[PDB]
Design an enzyme around this catalytic site. Sequence first.
Site, PDB file in Angstrom:
ATOM      1  N   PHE A 180       0.873  -1.174   0.000  1.00  0.00           N
ATOM      2  CA  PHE A 180       0.000   0.000   0.000  1.00  0.00           C
ATOM      3  C   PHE A 180       0.913   1.228   0.000  1.00  0.00           C
ATOM      4  CE2 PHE A 180      -4.011   2.138   0.346  1.00  0.00           C
ATOM      5  CZ  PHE A 180      -3.631   3.396   0.781  1.00  0.00           C
ATOM      6  N   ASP A 228      10.041   1.681   1.171  1.00  0.00           N
ATOM      7  CA  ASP A 228       8.993   2.594   1.593  1.00  0.00           C
ATOM      8  C   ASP A 228       8.868   2.587   3.127  1.00  0.00           C
ATOM      9  OD1 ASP A 228       6.905   4.076   2.214  1.00  0.00           O
ATOM     10  OD2 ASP A 228       5.509   3.274   0.740  1.00  0.00           O
ATOM     11  N   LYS A 259       4.750  11.050   6.848  1.00  0.00           N
ATOM     12  CA  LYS A 259       3.995  10.984   8.085  1.00  0.00           C
ATOM     13  C   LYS A 259       4.622  11.624   9.271  1.00  0.00           C
ATOM     14  CE  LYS A 259       0.721   7.575   6.674  1.00  0.00           C
ATOM     15  NZ  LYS A 259       0.382   6.121   6.663  1.00  0.00           N
TER      16      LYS A 259
HETATM   17  C1  LIG Z   1       3.708   2.474   3.393  1.00  0.00           C
HETATM   18  C2  LIG Z   1       2.862   3.666   2.899  1.00  0.00           C
HETATM   19  N1  LIG Z   1       3.397   4.418   1.872  1.00  0.00           N
HETATM   20  C3  LIG Z   1       2.661   5.475   1.362  1.00  0.00           C
HETATM   21  C4  LIG Z   1       1.427   5.776   1.866  1.00  0.00           C
HETATM   22  C5  LIG Z   1       0.580   6.888   1.217  1.00  0.00           C
HETATM   23  O1  LIG Z   1       0.657   8.091   1.988  1.00  0.00           O
HETATM   24  P1  LIG Z   1      -0.395   9.301   1.683  1.00  0.00           P
HETATM   25  O2  LIG Z   1      -1.746   8.848   2.225  1.00  0.00           O
HETATM   26  O3  LIG Z   1       0.181  10.469   2.451  1.00  0.00           O
HETATM   27  O4  LIG Z   1      -0.425   9.462   0.179  1.00  0.00           O
HETATM   28  C6  LIG Z   1       0.891   5.034   2.928  1.00  0.00           C
HETATM   29  C7  LIG Z   1      -0.278   5.443   3.429  1.00  0.00           C
HETATM   30  C8  LIG Z   1      -1.111   4.772   4.247  1.00  0.00           C
HETATM   31  C9  LIG Z   1      -2.281   5.227   4.693  1.00  0.00           C
HETATM   32  O5  LIG Z   1      -2.717   5.136   6.011  1.00  0.00           O
HETATM   33  C10 LIG Z   1      -3.368   5.788   3.753  1.00  0.00           C
HETATM   34  C11 LIG Z   1      -4.734   5.769   4.436  1.00  0.00           C
HETATM   35  C12 LIG Z   1      -5.606   6.950   3.977  1.00  0.00           C
HETATM   36  N2  LIG Z   1      -6.618   7.230   5.010  1.00  0.00           N
HETATM   37  C13 LIG Z   1      -6.103   6.655   2.569  1.00  0.00           C
HETATM   38  O6  LIG Z   1      -7.160   6.046   2.268  1.00  0.00           O
HETATM   39  O7  LIG Z   1      -5.326   7.032   1.647  1.00  0.00           O
HETATM   40  C14 LIG Z   1       1.634   3.967   3.419  1.00  0.00           C
HETATM   41  O8  LIG Z   1       1.094   3.168   4.409  1.00  0.00           O
END
Ligand SMILES: Cc1ncc(COP(=O)(O)O)c(/C=C/C(O)=C/C[C@H](N)C(=O)O)c1O
Lengths: 404, 404, 404, 404
Positions: free
Chosen positions: C142, C228, C257
Amino acid sequence: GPPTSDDIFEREYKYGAHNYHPLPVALERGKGIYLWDVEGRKYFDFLSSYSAVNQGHCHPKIVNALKSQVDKLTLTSRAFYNNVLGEYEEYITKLFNYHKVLPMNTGVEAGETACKLARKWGYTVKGIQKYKAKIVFAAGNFWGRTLSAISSSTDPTSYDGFGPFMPGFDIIPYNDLPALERALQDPNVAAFMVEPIQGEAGVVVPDPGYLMGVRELCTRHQVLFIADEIQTGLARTGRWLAVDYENVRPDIVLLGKALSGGLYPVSAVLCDDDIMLTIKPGEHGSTYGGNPLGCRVAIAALEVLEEENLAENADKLGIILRNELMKLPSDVVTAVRGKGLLNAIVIKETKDWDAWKVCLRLRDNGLLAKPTHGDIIRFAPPLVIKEDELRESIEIINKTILSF
Amino acid sequence: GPPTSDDIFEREYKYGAHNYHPLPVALERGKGIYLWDVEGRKYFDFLSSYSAVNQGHCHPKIVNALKSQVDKLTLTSRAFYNNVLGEYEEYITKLFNYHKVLPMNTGVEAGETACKLARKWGYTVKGIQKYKAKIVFAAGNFWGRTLSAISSSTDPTSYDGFGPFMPGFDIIPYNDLPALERALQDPNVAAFMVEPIQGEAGVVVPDPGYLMGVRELCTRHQVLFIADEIQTGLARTGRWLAVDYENVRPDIVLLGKALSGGLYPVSAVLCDDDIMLTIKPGEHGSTYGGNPLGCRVAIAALEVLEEENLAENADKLGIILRNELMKLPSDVVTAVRGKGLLNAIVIKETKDWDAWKVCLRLRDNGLLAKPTHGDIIRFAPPLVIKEDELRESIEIINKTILSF
Amino acid sequence: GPPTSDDIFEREYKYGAHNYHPLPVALERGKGIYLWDVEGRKYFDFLSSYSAVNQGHCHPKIVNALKSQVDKLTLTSRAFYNNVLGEYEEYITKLFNYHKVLPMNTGVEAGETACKLARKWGYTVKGIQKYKAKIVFAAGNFWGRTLSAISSSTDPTSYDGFGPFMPGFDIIPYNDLPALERALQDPNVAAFMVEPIQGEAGVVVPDPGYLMGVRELCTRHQVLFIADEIQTGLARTGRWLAVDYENVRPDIVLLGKALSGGLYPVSAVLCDDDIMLTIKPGEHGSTYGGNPLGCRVAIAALEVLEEENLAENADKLGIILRNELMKLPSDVVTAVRGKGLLNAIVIKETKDWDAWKVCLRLRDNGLLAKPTHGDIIRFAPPLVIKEDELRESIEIINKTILSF
Amino acid sequence: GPPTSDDIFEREYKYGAHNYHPLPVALERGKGIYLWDVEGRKYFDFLSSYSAVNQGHCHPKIVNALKSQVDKLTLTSRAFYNNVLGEYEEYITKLFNYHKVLPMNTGVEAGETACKLARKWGYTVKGIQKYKAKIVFAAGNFWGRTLSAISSSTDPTSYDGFGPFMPGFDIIPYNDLPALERALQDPNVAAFMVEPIQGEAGVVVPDPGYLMGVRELCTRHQVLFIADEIQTGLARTGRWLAVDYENVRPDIVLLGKALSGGLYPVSAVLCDDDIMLTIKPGEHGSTYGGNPLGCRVAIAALEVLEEENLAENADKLGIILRNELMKLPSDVVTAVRGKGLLNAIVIKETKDWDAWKVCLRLRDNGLLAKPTHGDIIRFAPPLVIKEDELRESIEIINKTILSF
Ligand SMILES: Cc1ncc(COP(=O)(O)O)c(/C=C/C(O)=C/C[C@H](N)C(=O)O)c1O
Ligand SMILES: Cc1ncc(COP(=O)(O)O)c(/C=C/C(O)=C/C[C@H](N)C(=O)O)c1O
Ligand SMILES: Cc1ncc(COP(=O)(O)O)c(/C=C/C(O)=C/C[C@H](N)C(=O)O)c1O
Ligand SMILES: Cc1ncc(COP(=O)(O)O)c(/C=C/C(O)=C/C[C@H](N)C(=O)O)c1O
């Protein structure tokens, strides 16, 4: 009533794939060197099911071996042991002088296993980086019809329309020592697989010394010599192995066909421990490989070969066959070749005269043979045949060929 | 005198390849659901030789068909016609309702044949550019041990050390319709090959509707649906074909194993003319494929399934087996699954207790089973088993499992 | 008066997209490890906004950096220079020992940047023909919600209905070295992207040695290793990077994050010059990327992690958290996993008892968590938590779990 | 001591990616229409961070909203609810008269969201077969730097070296109704995305009637009209939306940049329920999307635009700006274009005189601008600018241009 030859052909045309174009004859019975069609006609079998019936059709000792075991146990699978496999293993390993055997069912399965052993040995013992191992083959080779096997073929009928092909298979001319030496300069080569005489290519016999030269090159370059004796082995060329003519000991020997006398698909992969044991428990197998029923028939089929001295017979009788075939006119029959009872003739084909037409008339005159292209005819009768029977078939062959 | 179990084990260790790590038991006789070791002990066979003895060991009708044909004719090869093949072809094609059948010997050979047909149809009918055709497989698949079969596997024990791998094979998760829909966006996909229930993966049963969704998607995108029923077919799951549970018609059906009742390696590729006839004469084959001996036994093997209504019996008894196994404590047996008489249990494996240990104790208590990983045990007895015998076996399983 | 929790849900239902189904709790305040709802209730935050508030909600030093900079300058855009970016660049690159950083805002943007670097490096340095470059990913990954990110996902909820998908993205199982080795035989592969511990897949920790093996295989086959660490980095697992546990240095590291302590969307892409400089001026960017306000807050966020030795605390307390969790009954809680303070439990889900229901009760008992399917619950409180607070939270978990 | 402008450039050169080549000026402070460098020099900002600081740098009301909320709660993530998001959702949706909003952070994320909505709507409502949906774009478009966004670009600098590209994205000329009409004959088209005025392409204003014609054609052929107002929206062109000039209501409106006044990356996707609700819970999101801190600042940013009647001011002053610019010689300044305060001039570029050189001199004379190729210079000061200040800036432009 009973189906006619024409009924038989029509039925297969309707319900069976059209992957073969057989010579038009419908057999219902086989014994020794003879075959009988449904119309009751008698025929000399000069193909022997590609050597599977070296011991003749339905040999009584092999039949009795089959009948005896089928009432006891036919398949445990190799998830468990049975009483028969180990006895067959000790027997065939001691006969050919290799530490072990890996039992499979069909000829192509022995070849696939041998390629897997070659690669696994290549990586774990020779130190080749995964997955850069190469296997070299000779142009004209034929070892089956899996995707892997057609990937080393130089025959468009085998590979066309069936790609993409298996990588890491390199092809060189057959009977060519300098080409082999050139290929073996690459340290990523794990093995060279070759037929001592190419069967499907048209009974192509490499020059004297070829096999000894292949052995020397493989040993120098730390390359496994895989000898495919599925068709040439088991007495058909006049020895236990065709490779025996030059005293050559391959690293891996493949056996099939006559190994069961035509009663069951049994094939074998023979090699010593340093190669065989590269494959660990769980890394290779087959549902039917090593089943007790095929082992019983294999022990019997090997015993017939030894006890009836069929290699000596095939050697003495093969000389006669070739000597009589060379008397045909050189403007009709271009060449005569083979070893033991694995022979072929090359004819001077024209647009109106070909190998198929010759086999049709042979059929008409009581002898069954199959053409290997427009201009090649194979002659390989069961090894149980007698000189009188052979001379009778030669007359049939002479009469037919000269009758055109 | 006669070898002991330990002597049998030792002999194979010396003269046979170590590609298997069998459960230590040495059988010499089999009949119906039972096997006898060399010490004379009697066991329930809960492996059925990987579903090849669905009809039970040494079924009289199948044995009789073998003994009858072996005296007449066993192998003519495909160079000529034999009177038996066509009778078998018409029988099996009408039974499964496909135009034609291509006869082979082992399970993997049927799969290789299906891949070749898919590719040939892909290039000559669908119009895919040579050689860009793809074949999609499900993770967990097991269709044999050739270099091509292991190239689609996700199990390292199958492929590790055996590459380079065959190109053109893609893998998607099993039981996942959105994933198949995504993969079939590529117009270069010629087919999707899948088992209705994955056997070697651990008797993985897809959700209700998966098969209908696969048929729908394949039809929608002009992709052949190849159903490998080599282990799931012929009454094992309670139907002629496991795909029958959803009344779906694959484009290509693969059969093997119990097609002979364990007496001969017979496999088959069924499909209609538009697919089958893409392979022309001389473009595919096998030495032993379609031999008369294997045909006689396969006709009899198929008759037994039919005459004895083994599909209904497997369906009725399979539900009893699973419902009984679910009564075991959920802290020892984590899951029960299967269809018909193709079942498995998942155990709560620890460092000290595993599937192998459970199977050794099962053997000691008179039932033979083989683990599929450290936590999965397969339960697949011959389909001729009776309810009282099944409940006796169940007591043996409960006793063994609860004994730890 | 002020809206009730229920009014808050209703308002969002009416005016906001329904792309989420959050746990029904409305928070208005957060400080350290705690969160308060609009009814005044206090809760332990055991999600930490997916690691964004590793430093706890509203850390005073980060807040102060925010307030200080917002009075000065917040966004000049990259058309000009700002005095803050370079200071943050020198700081973060020396911290992680890579030549350069490329600043972005969200986690998916850093992943997109890393894919573009890998392709550009692939064509301009590795020599791959345009546009044949491949990127390999692990099943369960993810990395965001862009069209490209969901194209590498194996989760139907991420990709279903959103295609056609980005080509050139291949997927292999996670924690599988043989599968990676097999994929990297294609010289058109430019990179392998992977999470050291998969977050959204349910805190899946690969086996010891996986990271080292990934590093080795990538170097051996000239493939870029993209790690990642957006969720696993910046002290959450007990180290600056989860890859530090194996002393592995990836080619590209992604961070996000916690890089801002939850006060601003800040993400970073770290790598050396031979990779970073494949992208030239005007070839990649982002309006908000590297703005002075986010840089000031990122400098402070990193300083808090270092100064307060949060990695050491997360390591020490993570041991405690997992040790206490494993005391729960094995028939209720099937597994406990994680590293440092990134953990999760797997429960024995039934039709009537699931992760959502457990999380509702947790909330009722003062602890907030996120369920990640029907059987996984993540436990990841801010790294500023103290042992007494942790033990108090653990009792709330025990109380809740045992209460069913 | 404190770093000099030159030290600032050098530091970034060493530690930051070289993805930009900014005008050499180092800013440390910004207030309203002005910016100050580290040497204390004052400059008029005529770029406004691409419209992000429409309200001027560090507007006191937005700053205060930021400071107020950062002491309360900044990020809960979407796993739970925050009390602020719903208030912002109701506010912005009533402002623009659409049922719902989907909150994201950067401009490219809102575009990605809009593509995913259009595809989902295309398959689930329009009936397009998965995955044949198309999205049409206009040549010259710019919507970000993700792999998907550069796949619709016609600028080689955006896409070269970053492929393979996202399929299903088609491109037609901008300001071309016959071309759009032609593209929308394919029922597999789900949407057309376009900027009401192309920003990055050089402030390209389409002809009067283009927007109305886009609206008409999209409605006629059941295609979604996606208007990207990330740069042109929120008063910059002289109206709330640039599409308001023609009374056109797009199906999807994208907003960003000024939505936060430059204090936080905030973006929004507006559309009615029949489109928005095609995406279900768990099918799309973003970690920082809709966080309480960005919502508080967005509410204030919008309030400033409304309260200070900035659209009216931008309209009135834009007339003045363009009227004064057109007085420059036609042999030096070839064209003047724009709407409201989004403007640009085209110069008669030679090998020795270009936009970059003009922008260097502008900076020398106290005005900051961005050149957008070798012959375009954008003029877009904050909308809080006064007529006297504008006239002063215009003289700086006149002085500079005439000085060559
Ligand atoms: C390993 C890893 N690498 C990148 C990301 C993406 O990060 P961003 O959401 O800031 O684009 C994530 C993001 C995880 C995450 O919790 C996303 C949940 C968010 N509430 C959604 O549906 O996009 C990650 O777990
Ligand atoms: C040297 C050698 N090595 C292996 C094989 C493959 O043997 P099997 O057919 O059992 O897979 C063969 C097989 C020969 C053979 O079957 C010839 C004709 C065959 N019916 C065909 O598909 O064309 C062989 O000659
Ligand atoms: C669905 C399916 N499709 C094909 C095959 C291969 O069948 P054959 O073993 O006859 O090649 C099988 C065979 C499985 C099988 O017997 C696996 C274990 C076997 N003893 C081995 O180690 O290879 C199958 O389950
Ligand atoms: C009409 C329109 N729609 C979307 C975007 C992308 O916005 P974001 O940069 O926040 O992803 C933009 C962004 C434009 C813009 O100035 C990007 C420049 C930025 N310095 C870069 O290289 O990405 C836009 O003009």
